[PDB]
Amino acid sequence: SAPYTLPELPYDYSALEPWISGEIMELHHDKHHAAYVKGANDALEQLAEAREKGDLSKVNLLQKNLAFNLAGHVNHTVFWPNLSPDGGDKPEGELGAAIDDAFGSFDAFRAHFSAAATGIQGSGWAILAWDILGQRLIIEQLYDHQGNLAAGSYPLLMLDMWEHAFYLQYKNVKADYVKAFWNVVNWADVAKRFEDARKVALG
Amino acid sequence: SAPYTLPELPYDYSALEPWISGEIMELHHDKHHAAYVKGANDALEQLAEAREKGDLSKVNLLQKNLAFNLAGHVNHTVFWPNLSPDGGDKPEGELGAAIDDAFGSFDAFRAHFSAAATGIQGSGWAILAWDILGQRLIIEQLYDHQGNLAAGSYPLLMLDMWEHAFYLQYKNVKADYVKAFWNVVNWADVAKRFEDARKVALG
Amino acid sequence: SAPYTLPELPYDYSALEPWISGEIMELHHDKHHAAYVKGANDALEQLAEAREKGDLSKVNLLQKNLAFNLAGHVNHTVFWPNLSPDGGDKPEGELGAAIDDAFGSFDAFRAHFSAAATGIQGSGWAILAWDILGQRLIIEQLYDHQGNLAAGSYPLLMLDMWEHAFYLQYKNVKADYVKAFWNVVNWADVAKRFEDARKVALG
Amino acid sequence: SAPYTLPELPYDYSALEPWISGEIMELHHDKHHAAYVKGANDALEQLAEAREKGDLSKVNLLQKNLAFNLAGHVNHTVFWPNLSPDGGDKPEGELGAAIDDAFGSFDAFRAHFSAAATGIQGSGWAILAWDILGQRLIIEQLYDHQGNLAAGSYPLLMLDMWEHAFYLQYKNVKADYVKAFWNVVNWADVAKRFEDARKVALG
Ligand SMILES: [Fe+3]
Ligand SMILES: [Fe+3]
Ligand SMILES: [Fe+3]
Ligand SMILES: [Fe+3]
């Protein structure tokens, strides 16, 4: 099947200023995300080579390379369209109602998501996801790209808390980055994903 | 929405002998899985309490408790019907063809899955999953319940490599447990999940 | 440098009964610890080969194999002499006084240590250690063998909470294993370790 | 016991230019290291409170906060004096001879160390350490601050590969940061640490 590819940004590289700089968007998308695409394709290619030669002695390496890079690729693929120069404000419609039901209010959702974002020790993400078993909205606090999450959980809104996502602009003051993020959230994009996710069940 | 519950086993507790003992099935399902159900419901209840009282200072604890227990619950929910007293043999139909295409052959799939299973350092799982971004079959080697995996990946076939899943019968000789597992795989169940998973895309 | 070797047990397999079975002690020492010794020697051999042949692209694998196996070897090397058929009771002398100072009382230390032991999510350890920077006693809750700890911290008392350490005897009821453990702690060994540790500083 | 404190830098912020910028050194030491000092003291205070008030159900959180922050404090405490404006060149004397014996040559040590540094998937460190069991030099590739290492191993030379350590200057090009690092290694400091380490045994 077709290899992974780097998706293009769906807005100008400087479209998210003054909240996320064009300097960051260029490095983050063009360099960091590109590396995951290559790493994910390479992990699959190397696993196919291992199977074909009958030597799976490096399986642990290949499986971590696969998880790390595929997770990085999935996470950034969702992240870019989650942002918009026409973003901000609050979720509406069925997504807004579901957030009120799952978290109490938009304010409480935001406070929980923000606390999950700033609490990470090392690299990671705060995400809103749909649990396909319970058929419900949850927040997950990812470690690196591929840890601290349940299988099947379907990503809806991502916030990258790796230092490369904010350091050039905000230095160590990551809370100011988290606050800025709310200005650029593309709730229409999150709503489309929610429509897709709600059709998925574990079985 | 409705709380998580413990699913019943879909066969007799001793149905998988001599491959997995009834002694293990009873403890593993009735005690271990029950604990994840309670832990997952409790994590959500405690997160709701934290939001309502405006104190998210324990978010890191609650988010790991959620990930660990929800992942445990998802993983075992898929695991039980993945096994059957009428299991064994090989995948057929579109699932069999997809495994041949993704892994080269059933033998190569089995060798890769087995190597992933025995290579774990600590607790974990070998799983066959559908990557919802690439629309393709992959193996993932999970750490504990909730690590070393990509968001969205949809579980199809699980092998629990926590020591509680095999120690009473096989002691330290986990390779013999992995070999025994192939005798009880419910390929019809895996095929149904694959039919469900193939309808899911990241977007 | 000389290869790592498996230390002998300082007592007969059954010497810790009824608290820890001879059945477990034999498997645990003769099979599990032996595998970490081999794994640690193999990791060093493979690192030397990778340096010599130019294969340091495998470094992440080889360094995880080294950490996991060397940590397992270290941890079990401390564990066996930490137990004794003539143990139990309480720490005395300077060790007893330091535990009182650091934790409040022996009973409070036991409550904290026991909570760290039973709380592990996955495989791990509860340990008492000397922090060589702060020159003070701490508990550390290790993940697997090699996670959740500070460099230099010097192990004094170990409790193995991997399921292989207790499952055959206590099944899922790890609190009963932890309760049993206190009857076999070799406080004289812990005290010797403490004397050695207090001479170590980070500098 | 006395609370942890932030050690002063042994040189001016800009003393490592052009290899590591004063801009980074100031943020890194004055903001990031300060936070680990506070976090480590806070973790110990919160553990004492949990013991006293009966709240050890929070033990997993408090022990992760302790490990993460104490490890960060340890690691940076070693890092600053490991660097010098009068460094670079090569290890000599007994340290140089031991590196030749353990790694083949200084050049082979540098290749291994550099591969461990650039290979990290997430935040972490490459370190040279003394294994207090085997009485030998090893490299360890730390995850975050507190992962992928063996208890007791005594740190000699640290390279911080968290993105905050290099991003403002080197952006995503971490190989150029690692190349730069060799020009500022304080081999006299590493040699002192090695003298101290060789007197430590696991026992
Ligand atoms: Fe990123
Ligand atoms: Fe299980
Ligand atoms: Fe063990
Ligand atoms: Fe740092």
Numbering used by the authors:
A (entry chain B), B (entry chain B), C (entry chain A), D (entry chain A): 2 to 204
Quote the paper.
Superoxide dismutases (SODs) are enzymes that catalyze the dismutation of the superoxide radical anion into O2 and H2O2 in a two-step reaction.
The structure was determined to 1.25 Å and refined to a Rwork of 11.5% (Rfree = 14.1%). The structure has a dimer in the asymmetric unit, and the biological tetramer is generated through the crystal symmetry. The metal center in both Fe- and Mn-SOD is bound by equivalent residues, being two histidines and one aspartate as equatorial ligands, a third histidine axially coordinated, and, most probably, a hydroxide as a fifth ligand completing a trigonal bipyramidal coordination polyhedron. Even if the TfSOD is resolved to high resolution at 1.25 Å it is not possible to assign one of the solvent ligands (W1, W2) as hydroxide ion from the observed electron density, still, it is an option a hydroxide ion is present as reported for other SODs. In high resolution TfSOD crystal structure to 1.25 Å, the iron has octahedral coordinated, and the quaternary structure is tetrameric. The EPR envelope display g values of 4.90, 4.23 and 3.60 that are characteristic for a high spin ferric iron in the enzyme active site.
